[PDB]
Design a binder for this molecule. Structure first.
Ligand SMILES: Cc1cc2nc3c(=O)[nH]c(=O)nc-3n(C[C@H](O)[C@H](O)[C@H](O)COP(=O)(O)OP(=O)(O)OC[C@H]3O[C@@H](n4cnc5c(N)ncnc54)[C@H](O)[C@@H]3O)c2cc1C
Ligand SMILES: Cc1cc2nc3c(=O)[nH]c(=O)nc-3n(C[C@H](O)[C@H](O)[C@H](O)COP(=O)(O)OP(=O)(O)OC[C@H]3O[C@@H](n4cnc5c(N)ncnc54)[C@H](O)[C@@H]3O)c2cc1C
Lengths: 438, 438
């Protein structure tokens, strides 16, 4: 309840990276006292289920329980730990053997790097010995929607939190037409999710984006096209090559006008058009932000200053093997958050273990990716029963990124390929490492 | 001298930044053991005298003694400390209360960050606890000269080291014409030095550069032009707007041909056209280079990795007040080197004290500078008795750089102006702080 005046380990933001760092610290410093300061009233929880498993649950009380069944059939909660796992912030300095506390509903509004101090929105001040910035990011919006009136904004969801899942799940049961703007994995996952729900009600789900196919920036054109067909088969009207010119309300309906002259009538909009790193604290903290990738600029060890690290979506870090990056993946927040916790306890380790990404777009599509995955890089695809396959992303004749298409339990192989940096003469032989033959 | 297997503090490079760090480390830890590895045969020495005082010495043995009198008339050596200040590398781990050693004539060729180890050109391996990279930079040459024959290269000086001063000084007494290429402070300082020698000796000194006038990139056009006139008054033939097309030999002499119709014939060429940061070790070390400014990319505390720092000309650092920069100034090497040393002894403080710059172009021109000094920025100059004046460099209606023209003992005032960063209603009133009125 009441924030202590001083804490050894202070973690800013109560998300995935923060929780991984808290567990990492406690593992290496058993009696450590870690304080997470989270503006969100919720305790740390994982987000991937918010766009997937929580929508495919048979339990009608899922919106209340926030529980789901994993791939192996085991049921669990999206929260990393139950409330009993944590200690209260007030008892954190006094409790024997320390623990992990979460100060929910409180925002760090000022970072005093000189005096190792943070100021909260309620005027409280907390001094620290080692600080992790794990603020993640805010979902971006459209300028066309920003310029629109207040009703348009109130009928637009920026999907990221538990509150967005509950509000949107209720909307899906109240309106007849939901439009998703954005072709990325998130927008495509929400389209498949709302798509399955729409079938029970006979409602409409629309997805439009500027690219020529789903994940146009990520997957090569041919696979992006195939994926778009699978999204359509999930009960989605996909409108590629769509750039939003303006948005307004006409007779109660939302009217989306595209630059190509087309117009779309809908009841509600979901905007999935990228993430904005939360770097407000860089101003008072005098911390550097990366102008190319956004976010806090940190080195290979995720360190910004003597006792300040950054992990998760907010951390623009230097990859020794792949260059400066900023990754927005669940496993990355775990890996980078875990790494930060180790470095905050003297590990002095650099980012080395490459984190992975995954996405599920209906039952027939499951993606796993790792490394530099971008459609503008040269690509070589090897497939077998359309069906499954691997896509290698090349730079300087070396594989720097891999996308696995309906191939599971083989990420270590992909990680080793990127690691060794070997110049392969025939990627067909390399595809056999992923059980792709013929 | 032989290198130990281990040393607590390892400084790569034996220049100004390295010495300032060694002095700083020892000041903080009077028992520290510091090893400087220098590819140069010389002990650490300051460079500004190589283009100024050493050429105006009243001692005809200056080229051998390398001693000179400062502005206050106090004689001293170009070396930071005499050999008695240092100990041998072999005895460094065994001498009680440690000391500072300089491994001369050895080049670190490999940096193994993982194992905190370096490899020398002779195969020796040295492990460290904390490491500073102070490798400075190599003088840049001209493509036109790179294309010329070996004889042309043999008669071109890349002025930077003690050997270049001795070689060029010997030449000035053996040839009839020397040509300096480059309009910066270095080229201009050398022009004034050789020009004075040419006065009471009967020889020619030529300076040519593509800019409209000396320090075209630094000073405003009107002040650059005024400075060019006084360099000429020192006995120099200044040829602005000169772009070299080729360099060849003609009857034993060097014939420079500019892109325009002009042609210059001289006996010797001195090239002073910028510096190339020495970042060879970034490859094996897995260290990040700055593609914009060059050099190693470090944070505000001059840190690159957990136990690696960078200082001096080779350090691209984050200036909390002015942004990311890389400065190539003597005082910067001292300030950043000693700040590095402090941070290598647990200080953990950012670059906050702004370093200054100076240049002497004859007896009637004394420049001092601080902050972001760039002719492409908007400037406001205030002058009194042409005489003296101050040049304010503005960004966002705030002073970010100051050049003082024949105004001394007032750098703390210029530093304070840049520190406060307040929008001034009238810069004339600010100029009064520098004793400029009417
Ligand atoms: C709906 C959804 C589905 C996803 N699905 C997948 C998937 O299938 N696969 C995959 O690999 N990745 C997926 N991701 C990405 C993954 O969830 C993110 O990379 C991960 O959540 C990043 O965690 P984080 O801790 O870095 O940031 P966050 O989880 O955003 O944590 C930051 C927290 O700090 C708080 N905060 C911010 N500023 C302050 C402040 N000043 N003071 C206090 N608190 C502050 C924020 O409110 C927030 O609660 C998904 C993301 C979303 C949103
Ligand atoms: C002639 C001259 C005049 C100048 N006059 C002025 C002036 O009036 N005012 C001013 O402000 N600045 C002046 N400067 C600039 C100032 O001298 C520099 O900013 C300063 O020398 C930078 O010091 P440093 O230690 O960073 O680099 P350096 O002095 O270049 O030190 C680097 C050293 O490390 C060595 N080294 C490099 N790589 C390795 C390796 N792998 N292993 C081992 N050793 C290595 C190099 O050989 C060199 O000896 C002048 C410079 C010159 C050359």
């Amino acid at each position: 309840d009441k924030a202590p005046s001083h804490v050894p380990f202070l973690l800013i933001g109560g998300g995935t990276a923060a929780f991984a760092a808290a567990r990492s610290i406690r593992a290496r410093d058993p009696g450590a006292r870690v304080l997470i300061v989270s503006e969100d009233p919720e305790l740390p929880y994982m987000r991937p289920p918010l766009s997937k498993e929580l929508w495919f649950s048979d339990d009608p009380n899922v919106t209340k329980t926030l529980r789901f069944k994993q791939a192996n059939g085991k049921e669990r909660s999206i929260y990393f730990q139950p409330p009993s796992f944590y200690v209260s912030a007030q008892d954190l300095p006094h409790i024997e053997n320390g623990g992990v506390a979460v100060l929910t509903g409180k925002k760090v509004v000022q970072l005093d790097v000189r005096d190792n101090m943070v100021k909260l929105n309620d005027g409280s001040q907390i001094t620290y010995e080692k600080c992790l910035i794990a603020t993640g990011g805010t979902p971006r919006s459209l300028s066309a929607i920003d310029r629109a009136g207040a009703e348009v904004k109130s009928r637009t969801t920026l999907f990221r939190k538990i509150g967005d899942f509950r509000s949107l799940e209720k909307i899906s049961r109240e309106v007849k037409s939901i439009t998703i703007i954005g072709g990325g994995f998130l927008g495509s996952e929400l389209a498949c999710a709302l798509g399955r729900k729409a079938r029970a009600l006979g409602t409409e789900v629309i997805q439009l984006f500027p690219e020529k196919g789903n994940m146009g920036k990520i997957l090569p054109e041919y696979l992006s096209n195939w994926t778009m067909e699978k999204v359509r088969r999930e009960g989605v009207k996909v409108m590629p090559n769509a750039i939003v010119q303006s948005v307004g309300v006409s007779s109660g309906k939302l009217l989306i006008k595209l630059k190509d002259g087309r117009k779309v009538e809908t009841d509600h909009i979901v905007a999935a058009v990228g993430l904005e790193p939360n770097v407000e604290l860089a101003k008072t903290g005098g911390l550097e932000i990366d102008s190319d990738f956004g976010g806090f600029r940190v080195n290979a060890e995720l360190q910004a200053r003597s006792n300040i690290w950054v992990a998760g979506d907010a951390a623009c870090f230097y990859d020794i093997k792949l260059g400066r990056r900023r990754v927005e993946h669940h496993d990355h927040a775990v890996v980078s958050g875990r790494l930060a916790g180790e470095n905050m306890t003297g590990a002095a380790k650099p980012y080395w273990h490459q984190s992975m990404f995954w996405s599920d777009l209906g039952p027939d599509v499951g993606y796993e990716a790792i490394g530099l995955v971008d459609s503008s890089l040269p690509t070589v695809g090897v497939f077998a029963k359309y069906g499954k396959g691997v896509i290698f992303y090349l730079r300087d004749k070396v594989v720097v990124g891999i996308v696995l298409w309906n191939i599971f339990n083989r990420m270590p192989i992909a990680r080793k390929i990127i690691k060794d940096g070997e110049q392969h003469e025939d990627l067909n032989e390399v595809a056999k490492l992923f059980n792709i033959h013929e």
